[PDB]
Amino acid sequence: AFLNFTSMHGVQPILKRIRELSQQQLDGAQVPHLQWFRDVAALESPAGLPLREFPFAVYLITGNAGSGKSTCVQTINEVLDCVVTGATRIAAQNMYAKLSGAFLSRPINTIFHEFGFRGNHVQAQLGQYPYTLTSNPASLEDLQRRDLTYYWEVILDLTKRALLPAFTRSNVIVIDEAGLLGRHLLTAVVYCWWMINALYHTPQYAARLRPVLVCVGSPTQTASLESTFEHQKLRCSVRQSENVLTYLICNRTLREYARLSYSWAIFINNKRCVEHEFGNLMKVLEYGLPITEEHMQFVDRFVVPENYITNPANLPGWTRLFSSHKEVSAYMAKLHAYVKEFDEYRRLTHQANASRITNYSQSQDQDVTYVIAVTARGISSKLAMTITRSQGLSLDKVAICFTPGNLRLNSAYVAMSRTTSSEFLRMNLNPLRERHERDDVISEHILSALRDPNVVIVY
Amino acid sequence: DIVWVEESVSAITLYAVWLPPRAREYFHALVYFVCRNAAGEGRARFAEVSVTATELRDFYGSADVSVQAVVAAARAATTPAASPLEPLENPTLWRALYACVLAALERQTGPVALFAPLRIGSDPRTGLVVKVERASWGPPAAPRAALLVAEANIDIDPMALAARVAEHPDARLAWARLAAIRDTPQCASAASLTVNITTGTALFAREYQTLAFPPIKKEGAFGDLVEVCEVGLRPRGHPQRVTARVLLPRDYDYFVSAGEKFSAPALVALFRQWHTTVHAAPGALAPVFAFLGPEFEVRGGPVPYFAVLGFPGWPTFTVPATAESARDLVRGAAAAYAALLGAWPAVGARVVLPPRAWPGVASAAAGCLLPAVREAVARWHPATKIIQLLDPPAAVGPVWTARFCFPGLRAQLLAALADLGGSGLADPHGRTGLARLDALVVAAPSEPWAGAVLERLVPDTCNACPALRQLLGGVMAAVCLQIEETASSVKFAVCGGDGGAFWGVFNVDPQDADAASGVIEDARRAIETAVGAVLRANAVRLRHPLCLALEGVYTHAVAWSQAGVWFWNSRDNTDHLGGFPLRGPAYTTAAGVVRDTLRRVLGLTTACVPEEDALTARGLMEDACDRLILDAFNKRLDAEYWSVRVSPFEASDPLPPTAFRGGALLDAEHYWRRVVRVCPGGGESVGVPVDLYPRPLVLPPVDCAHHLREILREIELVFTGVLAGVWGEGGKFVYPFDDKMSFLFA
Amino acid sequence: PVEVTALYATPVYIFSYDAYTHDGRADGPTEQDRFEESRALYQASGGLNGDSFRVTRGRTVCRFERADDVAALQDALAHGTPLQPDHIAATFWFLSKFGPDEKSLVLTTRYYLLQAQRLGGAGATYDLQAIKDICATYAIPHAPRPDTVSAASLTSFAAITRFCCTSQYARGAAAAGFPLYVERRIAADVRETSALEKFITHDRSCLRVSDREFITYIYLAHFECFSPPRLATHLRAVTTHDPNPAASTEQPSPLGREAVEQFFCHVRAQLNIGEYVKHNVTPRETVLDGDTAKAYLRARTYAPGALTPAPAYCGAVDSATKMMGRLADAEKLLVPRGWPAFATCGIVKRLLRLAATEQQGPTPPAIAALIRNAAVQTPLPVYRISMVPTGQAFAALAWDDWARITRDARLAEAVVSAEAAAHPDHGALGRRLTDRIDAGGQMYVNRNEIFNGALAITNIILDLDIALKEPVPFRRLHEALGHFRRGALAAVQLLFPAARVDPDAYPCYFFKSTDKIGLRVCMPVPAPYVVHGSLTMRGVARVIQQAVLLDRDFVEAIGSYVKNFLLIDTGVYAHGHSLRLPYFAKICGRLLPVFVIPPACKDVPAFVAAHADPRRFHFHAPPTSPREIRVLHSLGGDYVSFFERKASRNALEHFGETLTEVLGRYNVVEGFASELLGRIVACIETHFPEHAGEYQAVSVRRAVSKDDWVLLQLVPLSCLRFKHTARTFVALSVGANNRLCVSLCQQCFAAKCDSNRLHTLFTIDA
DNA sequence: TTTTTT
Ligand SMILES: Cc1nc(N(C)C(=O)Cc2ccc(-c3cc(F)ccc3F)cc2)sc1[S@@](C)(N)O
Ligand SMILES: [Zn+2]
């Protein structure tokens, strides 16, 4: 009963900030007019698109996986006007489960549904047109124009199709696990907000209110990836991207316009870590602290051979994480052992799609022989998966298979943090004792945030 | 019709040891007498003896030895070029051999005595001494001497020493060298040996680069010292006329060698060269090349000596250092030679009696005693101390204390018990060795040379006969009982001691001194008389009348362990500390610090509650520790000062492979190994044998964080004893060396 | 005119209601006035007390004046009988989300829905779980239910309504005290929490500590303020049994009364130097007066004529192999007289031991064998030279041409005097002065003095590694350095209490090298002190580091630029670790002085020509007629955080054995390690069949010996991973349940595996 | 290497 106390009394300053952030009237001229979105439809290519500022606010809620940010979202929903959304369908259902466990929450959908994402947008060329930012210092208008040119094949279609949605009744948009969304989406959401409040001439648009994006997510346990498929080489590539959280934390233009210093809440405590040591490991991992000999000796007690994890006879009921989809396709098989379209497209190509033909996760992680979790609205074993997909959902028992050379300490931290107890955790090698490419750039940014008087830390 | 002369025998050496024909269990031994008549003129003489197998096994203590073994050893020793250093195989064999030949010389021929008048006869038909008799006419010539210095660089290969030390670990390095010469006698043929014998008539000096080669520098001649004598003899063993060459020592009598850097290999090599040179020409018999010393045994020995069992027939006395009183120790060595017939300290405990006749004398002495002491002997267990003493954590004062000692009680008691078992001896004439011990005891107070003999003859005799310890400690137990009984009558109170030495207190008022002397003297008189009466009643009669020594009067006395006692007389500030180990040069400074701290801490008798005194005492003890460790820093580079004398019995640090390269320095190591713990590099502490490296030494900084810890350990033992003995107990004085003053060295 | 707010769910069933009357006083209502008014409103016998009734992000109308209507309203409000359509018309989720208890089901439903927003206050912004928690601590006496009906025996609304209406948490004192108790509890809680967060935010903002210290601090402080016991006692204090506010059983809370007594008591310890020294450093000094002071000086400091200008060098300078061989050759002339045989760390240890060895009288010192001169006087400096392309060339010198090395940065007395006349200042003057600024060949290009633990340290040499967000102006840096001088001198006068450090005349020396502002700060150890020990200078460095991030001037000046506030590195003081000397480069930046003149320096030219003297920047330099000398040889050992020590104390008090003690269970080096090797042999065959028959016949040999890390090399070792030279090792530490963490580790001398780095392969239980 | 939106 005392567990809730800190959250109960520390979410109130958060609540007493989002209110003024949402009740701040804009000047008449700064409000995006309807004619703006009319001209956007007329524009064919995202080059002559005029530099247009779309005002918005943010409030950042950050912390470990089991930090308790969900309590903050719970308190927000029952007190404030809000449209609760999620970056993934799983995260949206998780929030619904945790919001209907206290009071009534309307069906929580994804942010993609909220701004009108439909079927044909799923496979759309989302990275085509270029942009030489007339920047340094980067004006907010230039950043928004970059994020609209990035999503031209989505923004243009949404604008054309538009030219009752839940964005017409609130200006506080809570995006949970927003680190799973790329930076292109942030501007997009704001842009779309103004759309749906301009065609309908909402009372908020008459009151000159502006969107406030309460982004709740873990900045060092979540990443966003962009996939582009080259249509001649047939080489589908996936590069890393800047998530909304990293975009907001690490961009000097957004950190000033949104004033992240007075608009940042870090939830700091785990509530399932009964191991001083498991907790200390997670702390060294989510903050970028120097790796010492003692940490190496602690994680030494988890290392079990390569042929012990991969052998299906060992660790029954333990989810096994690999860092390659081919590796999972091998392990699952081992465990089991224990015309017009392609005419015209061939014409147009001047001359791997099995993954790009359905839900990628199970499509590239399947041997279809089964022995489970529903993937779409397409079943997954939940017995073996990739580290990258593991970010989404927590696991009970975990055995991690690490490929040497490809060792990224963020991947190690994500893999090791999916389980509550360090007792039920086995690993291939020691990520702390092997060569690992650590990227501690967002870590120092949180550290400087933990070192700012205007940032609210909730224990 | 036997010839008769007047001479004094200066030495007795062994020439030949042969097995005559039709003989199986008795061997004849020829003895060379270096006789000198009046005014020093010397004529060489010879005698023959006949030792039986039984006598050999008696003087050996075991039947393992046989006549064949002795004759084989003598035959091997006949030639020094082929094989010198013969005794090193079985030192006990040659020890017993000299013992029995001297005993048979005493028995058959008669009473012999070095440096003393003696009427000597001879039979021309055979040509040997026939009978020796003590004479009573003549101011015999003074035992002249000659100063000998000899140094040789015997190029012994270090690896052989390392291997031989590996076979037997705690082998004194002089034994390692000596075994190396024995296994390779050619090494004694090449050495830069230099010799300088100075006499009162003419000096003689020679220098060699290779020993066999002619000298590279001469002085005087061999003939100035020696008068080579060819004497014909007809022993009962040899029917044919046998000629013997001997090196009559004209001008001098015995040798005097400095024991500071004495090298037994050096004199062995020089005498081997002389043996080869003199007996090179044939047509004559060859003598025995035998020498004994502490360097001839694996574990070494306490007292330096160099026995001359054969060639050249001249005793050589090593007098170690003692430059201030060099004449005193030279006279002591001469007296020890003359009295015990030169067997001491080579023969051992057999000077008195055969090692195996003792089991009879001890039994024969357990019978003539009184009935009570008869059982008291039989119930003696090591360190019984059946007498009312003080608890070892205790202290006394201010009361009139006094220490007493019976000078030479174990030796005197051994002499009396030997006489009690004398009737039980097989031969009344075989009791002459029992006349040397009485001569030692009688002359012990008069001259200290008998002392050091008796402090080693007695403990070694007690090891020859284990049954004698239970007899001596039972007689001393009886003495302590009457000491305690008489003590009560004269206000004396037994509080501690170790038998012959005992300290106690007096129940007189602790302020009056005029009458203190009277009671302290009457207690001495009464205790001495009562102990003498008990000894007389026990039939044991002492040759020198018993005397008690007042070894000091003190007012405060504090004891912590069984041997640790500190006494202090406040009036004259005379103190005495015992039980503190003097295991080096730093332990003496520690003892001085302790004897000053205790003098200051028992000066705190100012009226105070006992609790206050404990703290103002512990503070001063900690301050004394501080002033000791501060002065330790100013001598951190004196490795010899931070040195510990390890015995060949105690666990020792392992010898570095470079200490086997000391050359003419490994020979000095006979008993003690002086080790200093230095700290090379870091963490590791390694031991350096200090006296096996040339000087000046170069070393890593001395690990004072090891020696000072042990010195401090014993200081805290003494300080915990005094703290828990004068004031209330419960305080173990510990000095935080590791924290307060560790930084100075580590 | 009594107004009722009623929640219903279908004849109408009313199950929660809030009755109120408009306050006729302007500001008359008090807490007890409100309590009396409410207790009058809710009739204890049952129902209300009025004659006419108007019954009506927000969480959620009929008149009643005729006798029949009011009678029906009382009947339906005190018992729960449904209101028929005529009376009005003429005028599991709930049991789930509003607690299982009757107290919750009545009182929390009344407050969170029909009472929170109307009455305003802080409770309007609190969630349902928070309000239920407040109700749980509203522990008024509980009388038994007359019908003994359980709260879970309710199926329809006719049961919940009957439970609530005939409850005794609904028509009297409890129904009147709950709204006031919500306000009281929140007020008491926020009073304590807000105070604790004021302290938290302030200390966080002004901490200026290393990144790792900060994490422990936030977590531990949050635990003290918010912890199971502290929060429990705080809520127990606010707990009220009497609803009446005058005699409420809630008193001040123990939380905010124990933290300000335990950790926040010492949150102001790291917050102020004077308290950081008192509670975090344990000084251990030993005074040595007389000839022993002179003795300790020469014995533990570089010889007098070793850091004094000489025309040419004299020493042993050579590469690793050439000095390894020369060290052995010197030992061949050193072994004959005592030095034991030593059959890049061994070379540095041996060179340091040779340099430390002192002169015994007029005899040439031990290092004279290597340096080859009789004028050599020990102790001596030992340097490390990095060459191109590589090669650590160690160089032990007895004298060197330091006049030549510092000649470039030596300013003539005339120049400094002329600048002093032009600029009579200390900040703008140092500005002008700074603006006016083969192993044998590499000696004068790169040197790194190597710490010798045998000798005594006389200068506080701190390596300031500053990280930068962007390029900085020099003036800001010089002002920050003045602030650093101030803070360091305060810390020095705190650490050495019997000294006299006037922080306007005591000379501190500064040297500066897109990445970092390389700084080196040299301070004379004030007389009569001398510091001994690597750990002692580690502690001095921690005190200085946590003292400079206390002066507001330094953090205000350089704070906007330093990404990580950690400035001082404390790992360059271990035995055998080198520090780059000033007036030297790196093989990219020649450390050159930056002059921060003392504010009241009485000799400026001396201060400038004091940076060129090597003694000012050497660890074990000769101290510049000593009566007394105080050796600070300990400032406390392992400096467990002044916080994590409390996190070490709280570690067990909340969570719950060393390696040696755990070994006692196994009756405990090579003996038991070979037994564990037997278990390893059985599993290595299955886990790694390619080298199954290799470690079956190997011998354990302890290579690394640590308190919690016993590493034993398996000397017979082909690498199990990346099968192709490799060394196998047996680790020993603490297991999951305080067991034995025995690990198989295959360090590999190949490029594929991290070269010479220790790796783990499997950890098995014992 | 690398998921996800209908
Ligand atoms: C004794 C003690 N106990 C403490 N508690 C309750 C915890 O450490 C709890 C906990 C455990 C894991 C995480 C954690 C989880 C992540 F996923 C990432 C990062 C994280 F830190 C956070 C909190 S804190 C202390 S102290 C040392 N501060 O005195
Ligand atoms: Zn390898």
Strand partners, B148: B197, B257
- Nearest residue to A59 (alpha-carbon basis) of A33, A35, A80, A90: A80
Residues C336 and C354 in one domain: yes
Method: cryo-EM
Long-range contacts of residues B43-46, Cβ cutoff 8 Å, at least 24 apart: B43/B5, B43/B7, B44/B229, B44/B231, B44/B246, B44/B248, B45/B7, B45/B120, B45/B122, B45/B128, B45/B129, B46/B15, B46/B127, B46/B128, B46/B129, B46/B231, B46/B233, B46/B244
Residues C42 and C95 in one domain: yes
- Residue carrying the six token digits 């009139």: B400
B660, B666 Cβ separation under 8 angstroms:
yes
Residues C348 and C386 in one domain: yes
Residue ID of nearest Cα to ligand 1 atom 21: A283
Residues C158 and C195 in one domain: no
Torsion region of B110: left, alpha or beta (phi above 0 gives left; psi -120 to 50 gives alpha): left
- Nearest residue to B658 (alpha-carbon basis) of B712, B618, B709, B698: B698
On strand D, nucleotides with any atom < 7 Å from a protein CB are 1-6
The verdict on B637 touching C (C-beta cutoff 8 Å) is yes
How far apart (Å, rounded) are the C-alpha atoms in residues A129 and A46? 7
The verdict on A300 touching C (C-beta cutoff 8 Å) is yes
Task: Kindly report the number of other CB atoms within 10 A of residue C475's CB atom.
Answer: 12
Substitution target from C131, C185, C215 for chain A, most A beta carbons within 10 A: C215
CA distances from C336 to B176, C122, C492 (A): 20, 89, 48
Q: How far is the CA of A280 from the centre of ligand 1 (A)?
A: 6
* Structural domains of chain A in order of their starting residue, each with its CATH number: 5-269+449-458 (3.40.50.300), 289-338+352-427 (3.40.50)
- Nearest residue to A40 (alpha-carbon basis) of A159, A198, A147, A182: A159
B539, B373 Cβ separation under 8 angstroms:
no
How far apart (Å, rounded) are the C-alpha atoms in residues B404 and B528? 10
Q: Which residues, 6 or more positions from C481, have their beta carbon under 8 angstroms from its beta carbon? A: C510, C519, C594, C596
C386, C587 Cβ separation under 8 angstroms:
yes
- Nearest residue to C300 (alpha-carbon basis) of B355, B370, B293, B743: B743
Could you identify the residue whose CA is nearest to the C1' atom of nucleotide D6? Answer: A119
**Residue C222 alpha carbon, nearest atom of ligand 1:** 28
How far apart (Å, rounded) are the C-alpha atoms in residues C203 and C217? 10
Strand partners, B247: B228
**C283 Cα distance to chain centroid:** 22
The verdict on C283 touching B (C-beta cutoff 8 Å) is no
Token digits of residue B657: 């492979």
CB atoms C762 and A302 under 8 Å: no
Concatenate the DSSP letters of all residues of C150-205 into one string: -TTS--SHHHHHHHHHT-TTSSSHHHHHHHHHHHHHHHHHHHHHHHHHHHHHHHHH
Q: Report the gap between the CA of C228 and the closest CA in chain A (Å).
A: 7
Nearest CA in chain A to C129: A102
**Residue A66 alpha carbon, nearest atom of ligand 1:** 17
CB atoms A288 and C211 under 8 Å: yes
A247 CA, D4 C1': Å apart:
19
Residues C454 and C561 in one domain: yes
B286, B76 Cβ separation under 8 angstroms:
no
CB atoms A297 and C741 under 8 Å: yes
Residue ID of nearest Cα to ligand 1 atom 17: A64
Concatenate the DSSP letters of all residues of C623-681 into one string: P------EEEEES-SS---TTHHHHHHHIIIII---HHHHHHHTT--HHHHHHHHHHHH
Residues C612 and C708 in one domain: no
On chain B, the residues whose CB falls within 8 A of the CB of C376 are: none
**C14 Cα distance to chain centroid:** 58
Count of domains forming chain C: 4
C285, C526 Cβ separation under 8 angstroms:
no
Residues C132 and C192 in one domain: no
How far apart (Å, rounded) are the C-alpha atoms in residues B435 and B426? 16
A87 CA, D1 C1': Å apart:
22
Q: Is residue C456 assigned to a domain?
A: yes
DSSP character for B567?
A: E
Concatenate the DSSP letters of all residues of B273-298 into one string: HHHHHHTTS-SSB--------GGGSS
Cis peptide leading into residue B140 (ω within 30°): no
How far apart (Å, rounded) are the C-alpha atoms in residues B53 and A279? 90
How far apart (Å, rounded) are the C-alpha atoms in residues C340 and B656? 8
Count how many residues are written for chain B.
Answer: 746
How far apart (Å, rounded) are the C-alpha atoms in residues A9 and A31? 36
- Nearest residue to C255 (alpha-carbon basis) of C198, C173, C191: C191
The verdict on A360 touching C (C-beta cutoff 8 Å) is no
Cis peptide leading into residue C389 (ω within 30°): yes
Nearest CA in chain A to C762: A304
Residue among C136, C219, C763 whose CB faces A300 most closely: C763
For helices C534-548 and C474-495, the axis angle rounded to 10 degrees is: 130
Query: Taking chain C, what is the end-to-end CA distance rounded to the nearest angstrom?
Result: 80
- Nearest residue to C240 (alpha-carbon basis) of C184, C324, C163, C159: C184
How far apart (Å, rounded) are the C-alpha atoms in residues B289 and B271? 9
Nearest CA in chain A to C217: A450
What is the helix (H) or strand (E) element at residue B417, kind and residue range?
helix B409-420
Q: In what order do the strands lie in the sheet containing C710-715?
A: C699-705, C710-715, C726-734, C740-748, C762-764
A364 CA, D3 C1': Å apart:
11
Residue ID of nearest Cα to ligand 1 atom 6: C223
Residue ID of nearest Cα to ligand 1 atom 27: C647
How far apart (Å, rounded) are the C-alpha atoms in residues C204 and A266? 14
Token digits of residue A315: 């660790």
Residues C332 and C446 in one domain: yes
Q: Answer whether A64 contacts ligand 1 (Cβ < 6 A).
A: yes
Q: Which residues, 6 or more positions from C561, have their beta carbon under 8 angstroms from its beta carbon? A: C466, C468, C469, C470, C472, C476
DSSP character for A225?
A: E
- Nearest residue to A167 (alpha-carbon basis) of A104, A210, A120, A118: A210
In chain A, positions 63-92, which contact chain C (CB-CB < 8 Å)? 74-75, 78-81
Nearest CA in chain B to C634: B739
The verdict on A350 touching C (C-beta cutoff 8 Å) is no
What residues make up the domain containing C629? Answer: 291-412+415-634
Q: Answer whether C215 contacts ligand 1 (Cβ < 6 A).
A: no
- Residue carrying the six token digits 């005087």: B220
C632, C496 Cβ separation under 8 angstroms:
yes
**Residue A64 alpha carbon, nearest atom of ligand 1:** 17
CB atoms A303 and C212 under 8 Å: no
Q: What is the 3-state secondary structure (H, E, C) of B306-368?
A: CCCCECECCCEEEECCCCCCHHHHHHHHHHHHHHCCCCCCCCCHHHCCCCCCHHHHHHHHCCC
**Which nucleotide has its C1' atom closest to residue A224's CA?**
D3
How far apart (Å, rounded) are the C-alpha atoms in residues B352 and A44? 132
How far apart (Å, rounded) are the C-alpha atoms in residues C348 and C392? 10
How far apart (Å, rounded) are the C-alpha atoms in residues C133 and C142? 17
Residue among B657, B661, B696 whose CB faces C363 most closely: B696
Radius of gyration of chain C (CA): 39
Q: Is residue C670 assigned to a domain?
A: yes
Substitution target from B676, B686, B743 for chain C, most C beta carbons within 10 A: B743
Residues C328 and C258 in one domain: no
Could you identify the residue whose CA is nearest to the C1' atom of nucleotide D4? Answer: A88
CB atoms B701 and C358 under 8 Å: yes
Q: How far is the CA of C427 from the centre of ligand 1 (A)?
A: 46
How far apart (Å, rounded) are the C-alpha atoms in residues C367 and C396? 9
Q: In what order do the strands lie in the sheet containing B204-207?
A: B204-207, B194-198, B145-151, B254-258, B316-319
- Residue carrying the six token digits 């640790």: B564
CB atoms C189 and A268 under 8 Å: no
Long-range contacts of residues B321-328, Cβ cutoff 8 Å, at least 24 apart: B321/B258, B321/B259, B321/B260
Strand D protein footprint, C-beta under 7 A: A 88-90, 109-110, 112-113, 117-119, 121-124, 126, 180, 223-227, 238-240, 323-326, 359-361, 364, 386, 388-389, 392, 406, 408, 411
C127 CA, D5 C1': Å apart:
32
Strand partners, A109: none
On chain A, the residues whose CB falls within 8 A of the CB of C189 are: 5, 9
Residues C91 and C140 in one domain: yes
Using DSSP's 3-state secondary structure scheme, residue A423 falls into helix
CA distances from B186 to A299, B83, B86, B516 (A): 69, 10, 15, 72
The verdict on B656 touching C (C-beta cutoff 8 Å) is yes
Q: How far is the CA of C722 from the centre of ligand 2 (A)?
A: 6
Query: How many separate helices (H) and strands (E) can be counted in chain B?
Result: 19, 23
Q: Is residue C247 assigned to a domain?
A: yes
Residues C572 and C597 in one domain: yes
Q: Answer whether A279 contacts ligand 1 (Cβ < 6 A).
A: yes
Q: Report the gap between the CA of C558 and the closest CA in chain A (Å).
A: 15
A200 CA, D4 C1': Å apart:
30
Q: How far is the CA of A394 from the centre of ligand 1 (A)?
A: 18
Token digits of residue B454: 């008796």
How far apart (Å, rounded) are the C-alpha atoms in residues C91 and C85? 10
Q: At A19, phi and psi to the nearest 5?
A: -65, -50
- HSE, CB side, 13 Å, CA atoms: give it for residue C461: 25
Q: Answer whether A280 contacts ligand 1 (Cβ < 6 A).
A: no
CB atoms C349 and B681 under 8 Å: yes
Residue among C291, C338, C360 whose CB faces B634 most closely: C291
Residues C333 and C474 in one domain: yes
**B548 Cα distance to chain centroid:** 25
Nearest CA in chain C to A303: C762
Using DSSP's 3-state secondary structure scheme, residue A325 falls into helix
C46, C171 Cβ separation under 8 angstroms:
yes
B165, B176 Cβ separation under 8 angstroms:
yes
